[PDB]
Amino acid sequence: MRIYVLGAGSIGSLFGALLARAGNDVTLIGRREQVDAINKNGLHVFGAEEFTVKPKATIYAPEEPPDLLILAVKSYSTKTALEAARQCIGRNTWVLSIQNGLGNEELALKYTPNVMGGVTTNGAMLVEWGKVLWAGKGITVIGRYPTGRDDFVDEVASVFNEAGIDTSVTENAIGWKWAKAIVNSVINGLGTVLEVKNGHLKDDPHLEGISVDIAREGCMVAQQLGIEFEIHPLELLWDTIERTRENYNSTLQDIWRGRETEVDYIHGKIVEYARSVGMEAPRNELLWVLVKAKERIN
């Protein structure tokens, strides 16, 4: 399958390399550092698995329409990225977002109805240009956005599974995006504010309870928007916490590296949609302000 990965960062390089090993026509689109590093010494994956591939790398999305375009930039870069890559979106090109936060798929829908949403539990960290750490293996869930199904979605899931990417298909992708967003609101909120590992958030009974509170806030916001959940975000919350006990959340890491966070598209979007349906959602807003303010004092 012809696959372009827009955003050759961590998870983009992971997915790109995994898809590259299987024999797929993979093109990575990213920074000039990443592109040069890959073009001269290849892309190296280490950790959960260790190998070296040589996918095509470039800073410009090729003017030749792929079968699949994977959005792998951070949420604050999506809209520009799409504009920078719209020349590659052909009539049958499907757009898959494996990003966190909300609104990415809706941004993708401005170019084509062929859009699918996705969430991955895989951990990836680009430690060096041309070098990515597969921190952990996890399940990936993709589906036609917002709901339903399509043969090509099944085919993408088949290519992924073949490629060693454990993938299942949902008919409620938007519910997964929102569930993941709520879990992320709790974890990337509290964990970042208190600067603790994820497991801590369940171990402290008060933190556990307030986690529950935040979660039901997000859930009520989602359900008033006519979004239901195949799997309730609390089960996904305690599961995710159980899988990442030894990990500091990605937002806290972003603050630590001096990087920009995605909370404008996590807590921010939840607050936005809440306001869009006449609600307010206090906890997500307070967490949003706190995290942004913490980021400001680098």
Query: Contact with a copy of itself (CB under 8 A): which of 59, 194, 220, 277?
Result: 194
Contacted by 206, from a copy of itself, ligand NAP, none: CB < 5 to 8 Å by type: a copy of itself
Q: Which of 74, 131, 177, 180 is catalytic?
A: 180
Residues 84-103 that bind ligand NAP (CB under 6 A): 84, 98-100
Contact between 287 and a copy of itself per CB under 8 A: yes
Residue placing its CB nearer to ligand NAP in the complex, 30 or 175: 30
Asked if 54 is an active-site residue, the reply is: no
Query: Contact with ligand NAP (CB under 6 A): which of 57, 126, 165, 271?
Result: 126
Indicate the residue type of 260: E
Query: Contact with ligand NAP (CB under 6 A): which of 2, 21, 31, 216?
Result: 31
Contact between 294 and a copy of itself per CB under 8 A: yes
- Residues involved in catalysis: 180
Binding residues for a copy of itself (CB under 8 A): 190, 193-196, 204, 206-207, 209-210, 213-214, 217, 282-283, 285-287, 289-290, 292-294, 296-297
